[PDB]
């Protein structure tokens, strides 16, 4: 399922992520855009033999057990397959386990490279949220 940004933003915002751990809404929306380009079905395989799942490319070495990564801690405690639903709920409750661990939104590569230091409010304008 592909998200229109406002459709994404309102669901992140209804799920309480606007300014959750100091990160305003713009941040969450910009990182989903560069991390999966608003596609909850996105996948990516890194050099560690580990995959990123869905909308907020959550990695399987740590966050979920995918079955295929031998170093898992599966910290949001979910099947990485849940992270690919059409519905962001799990991606968000897990994305919330992530930003609360001492690293902050820098644990999203695309965020630190594409969103850190640009005006992220440009992502929710026009939306009525």
């Amino acid at each position, epitope marked *: 399922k592909v998200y229109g940004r406002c459709e994404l933003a309102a669901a992140m915002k209804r799920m309480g992520l606007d300014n959750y751990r100091g990160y305003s809404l713009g941040n969450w929306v910009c990182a989903a855009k560069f991390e999966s380009n608003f596609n909850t079905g996105a996948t990516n395989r890194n050099t560690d033999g580990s995959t990123d799942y869905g909308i907020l490319q959550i990695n399987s070495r740590w966050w979920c057990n995918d079955g295929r990564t031998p170093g898992s801690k599966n910290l949001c405690h979910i099947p990485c397959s849940a992270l690919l639903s059409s519905d962001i709920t799990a991606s968000v409750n897990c994305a919330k386990k992530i930003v609360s661990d*001492g*690293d902050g939104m*820098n644990a999203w590569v695309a965020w*630190r490279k594409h969103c850190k*230091g640009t*005006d992220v409010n440009v992502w929710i304008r026009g939306c009525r949220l």
Partner: antibody
Amino acid sequence: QVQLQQSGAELVRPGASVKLSCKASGYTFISYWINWVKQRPGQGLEWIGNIYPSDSYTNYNQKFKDKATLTVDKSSSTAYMQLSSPTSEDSAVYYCTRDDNYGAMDYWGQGTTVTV
Amino acid sequence: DIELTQSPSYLVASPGETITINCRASKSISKSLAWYQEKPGKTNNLLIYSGSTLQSGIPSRFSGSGSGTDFTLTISSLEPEDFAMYICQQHNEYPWTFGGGTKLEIKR
């Protein structure tokens, strides 16, 4: 106790290069953005740039990108800043500060006087 | 580059009274301002970050308000040691920019 401590004062002949250092401790270095700041008396503070240490991904103020190099030695947790040919104006105090994860700077180094 | 005007550059005050510094950005920095105290013989102190949030460990008497262009630092009950330089700094977009500094002198 998060602690950034920089190198000592420098006197440098015009145009000779000088490399400043900032040994980080108290946290896991590669995880925070390091910046470098400068202040001369009367000017306010100016940002040189930052770097993210697990990948040396560097962001440069357009005004400094021609004049300074930001580098890190992951192993020894030292952040570096060099100036390739300092002219008279570059005589200032240079500050390494850690990024709080928001863009503000929550710890600071003591500072380094570079006297060209 | 956001230009922050800080105001005034000098304030003198007597301990027990309240002071207020303003910070004006050249464009709206969406509540992304941070404030610093610089006392001589001391590393730079982050007081407040993102318009209103308190850095951990700081006395409550420190307060910020603002949203796009004007933001303020309110300092009530002046202690003889919280007499220092205060610097605002935008962190909404690159480059990170700072104000000019209010030198805050204890009065006599």
